[PDB]
């Protein structure tokens, strides 16, 4: 299928409580594989998935030196953002960054990304052409002008079209057994009587990977969207996900309700029903 | 451009040096290199946001740092004679190319007593040359200097001149059978016979030498070989 | 792992001839390729920057091409001049590295020798004792084919040939200097270890 590598940085100032904290996390699709925390006793890039643990000391050293340099850059960016927004040094602020590449089934680059936020809102993003930027406010336009003059999009493009893709392609091979093998959901329908004439029909989906899934209830083949209590997809804690869709049905016609499970791990979409 | 200081340095075996690099204003990354005749340009380390982000293959005694204003320093501990080299820094930002400074020329010596300023002498054109070619060639000789930290220039009527000039690219060893051997440099200035046959025309050969600094010690009978200009002159002849 | 090679490492070319300088690199995933020149006792002088294999950067008589796939670059110098003489260095930076992080080749020492139209080889005597114990001999106006060799005697100092340019008159000339303390030193036998022309004028 299609794949992606993403790195996520969070830089948070905390005046009076020490240096701003910098946290970086790396993912291949929905699997976290690396972490860096500037608050650790000995900050270092460390493995978070089994298939990256094998990497040699040159890998861990290189990522660690880069993450320490990025931690200090985002401490300086936090100070710059205060001047751009005319904010005082007393408040706590956050910069967030998301970047990486998307590849097709052939391993070829489909799209590069490099987006930033300041205090939970878009700040600046690299456009799909990887040669121009979108600034979201007048402070980000100062960064846009600076980055356009310093040729930053060309530097990002060279990384996104090269090493971002090359490393993603290596991780997908090294970890092909978990990364390239979709785990279909283990599904079941529970029944819980809520009243004398009504019952709740919960359509569960467990241990599926990747996280993208679609659960839909149907009353005699008709898609019921307003009567569905749909929960956000949540992690099981073992690199698999869970999701449920519950409906309130009249006690008697429970079997006229069919759950339609849509997932990459299933050859054909599944159809479920409560089996007493 | 990128500025590096000092331009020239003489240090003794076993002591320490700290070199400075001010990148172009706004540049954020700085890399340091060592250039020796026999090993070419070799990478030391790259600094970005005060961090040694990339490192080459030099031992621990080659260290560095970068400040919040992006200025960088490098330091060499326990200097060896093999450490004599041109130390270059280069800066860049975003997607730009490298911009290099002019380097620090470091010479690690066995002793400060090996340091000597040059002696300069101008030699006037041969009358045989003036009659045969209708041209006059002045020769300047800078001799007995050590280390090779010199800049030779020609000045005609108070102005630095380049047309008709040629200085040796590399100097001569006065005793090739010695490591601390003093050096010799030659340079020529050729003018037309008519221009040499005018006493109003002044010709000076200047050799700027870079030697010991203020903090450096001196326990020798001869004058301290500090940074200084040594010149020789001649005037046109009717 | 990135290795940059410049072969040949030295080239001696007669003025006016077009020349090419070669550069090869083992890792094709580069961002920049820069050509520099380095003059004796000087640092680096950036000449050209090239990043695209389809484009071709020019700067007067300097022209550069790049082929990332083959790991090759060429620096073309049209109508070479003696002032082009210097060490030429090619350097490459990888993607996802600062532009200041380069892997350098070993360089090519280019020597462009002047076209001596009317050679008049001669050895001239220059100023005796007044402020120095030395006596200087000047071998000059010899054609560029002439090679100058170092003295056999330890008390005689000979410099290599040197090119001067009297731009005002479109005139160029080669020359070498010999000097000694010894009383027996004479212009006639100063450049004895060098093959000098037959018609060398000895005043």
């Amino acid at each position: 299928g299609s794949h992606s590598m993403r790195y996520f940085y969070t830089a948070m100032s905390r005046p009076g409580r020490g240096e701003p904290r910098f946290i970086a996390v790396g993912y291949v699709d929905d699997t976290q594989f690396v972490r860096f925390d500037s608050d650790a006793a000995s900050p270092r890039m460390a493995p978070r998935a089994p298939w990256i643990e094998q990497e040699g000391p040159e890998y861990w050293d290189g990522e660690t030196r880069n993450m320490k340099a990025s931690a200090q850059t985002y401490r300086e960016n936090l100070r710059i953002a205060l001047r751009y927004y005319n904010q005082s040094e007393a408040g706590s602020h956050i910069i967030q960054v998301m970047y990486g590449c998307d590849v097709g089934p052939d391993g070829r680059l489909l799209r590069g990304h490099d987006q930033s936020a300041y205090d939970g809102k878009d700040y600046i993003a690299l456009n799909e052409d990887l040669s121009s930027w979108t600034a979201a406010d007048t402070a980000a336009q100062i960064t846009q002008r600076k980055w356009e003059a310093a040729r930053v999009a060309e530097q990002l493009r060279a990384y996104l079209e090269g090493l971002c893709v090359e490393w993603l392609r290596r991780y997908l091979e090294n970890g092909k057994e978990t990364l390239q093998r979709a785990d279909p959901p283990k599904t079941h329908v529970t029944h819980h009587p809520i009243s004398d004439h009504e019952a709740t029909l919960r359509c569960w989906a467990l241990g599926f990977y990747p996280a993208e899934i679609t659960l839909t209830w149907q009353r005699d083949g008709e898609d019921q969207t307003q009567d569905t209590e749909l929960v956000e997809t949540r992690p099981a804690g073992d690199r698999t996900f869970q999701k449920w869709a519950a409906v309130v049905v009249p006690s008697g016609e429970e079997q006229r309700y069919t759950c339609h499970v849509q997932h990459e791990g299933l050859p054909k979409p599944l159809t479920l029903r409560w089996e007493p | 451009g990128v500025t590096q200081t000092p331009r020239y340095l003489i240090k003794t075996r076993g002591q320490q040096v700290t070199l400075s690099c001010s990148p172009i204003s706004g540049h954020r990354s700085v890399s340091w290199y060592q250039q020796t005749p026999g090993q070419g340009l070799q990478f030391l380390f790259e600094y970005f946001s005060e961090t040694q982000r990339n490192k080459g293959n030099f031992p621990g005694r080659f260290s560095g740092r970068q400040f919040s204003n992006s200025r960088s320093e490098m330091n060499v501990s326990t200097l060896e004679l093999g450490d004599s080299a041109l130390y270059l820094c280069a800066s860049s930002v975003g997607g730009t190319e490298a911009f290099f400074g002019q380097g620090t020329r470091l010479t690690v010596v066995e002793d400060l007593k090996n340091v000597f300023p040059p002696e300069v002498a101008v030699f006037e054109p041969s009358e045989a040359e003036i009659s045969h070619t209708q041209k006059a060639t002045l020769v300047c000789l800078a001799t007995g200097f050590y280390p090779d930290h010199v800049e030779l220039s020609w000045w005609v009527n108070g102005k630095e001149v380049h047309s008709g000039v040629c200085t040796d690219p590399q100097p001569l060893k006065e005793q090739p059978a010695l490591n601390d051997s003093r050096y010799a440099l030659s340079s020529r200035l050729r003018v037309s016979a008519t221009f040499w046959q005018n006493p109003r025309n002044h010709f000076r050969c200047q050799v700027q030498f870079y030697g010991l600094s203020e903090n450096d010690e001196w326990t020798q009978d001869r004058a301290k070989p500090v940074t200084q200009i040594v010149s020789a002159e001649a005037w046109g002849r009717a | 792992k990135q290795e940059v090679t410049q072969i040949p490492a030295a080239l001696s070319v007669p003025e006016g001839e077009n020349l090419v300088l070669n550069c090869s690199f083992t890792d094709s995933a580069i961002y920049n390729l820069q050509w520099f020149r380095q003059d004796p006792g000087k640092g680096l002088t950036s000449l050209l920057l090239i990043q695209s294999s389809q484009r071709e950067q020019t700067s007067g008589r300097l022209n550069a091409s790049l082929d990332k796939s083959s790991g090759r670059s060429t620096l073309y110098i049209a109508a070479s001049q003696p002032g082009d003489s210097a060490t030429y260095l090619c350097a490459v930076t990888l993607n996802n590295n600062a532009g200041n992080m380069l892997t350098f080749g070993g360089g090519t020492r280019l020597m462009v020798k002047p076209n001596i139209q009317n050679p008049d080889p001669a050895v001239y005597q220059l100023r005796d004792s007044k402020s120095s114990d030395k006596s200087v001999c000047l071998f000059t106006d010899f054609d560029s084919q002439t090679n100058v060799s170092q003295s056999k005697d330890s008390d005689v100092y000979i410099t290599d040939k040197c090119v001067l340019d009297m731009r005002s008159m479109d005139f160029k000339s080669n020359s070498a200097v010999a000097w000694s303390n010894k009383s027996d030193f004479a212009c006639a036998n100063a450049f004895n270890n060098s093959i000098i022309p037959e018609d060398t004028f000895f005043p």
Binding site: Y7, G26, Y59, E63, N66, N77, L156 | - | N96, A98
Partner: peptide, 10 residues
């Protein structure tokens, strides 16, 4: 490196 080496600030 697998991560981006940044070359500028905001």
């Amino acid at each position: 490196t697998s991560t981006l080496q940044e070359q500028i600030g905001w």
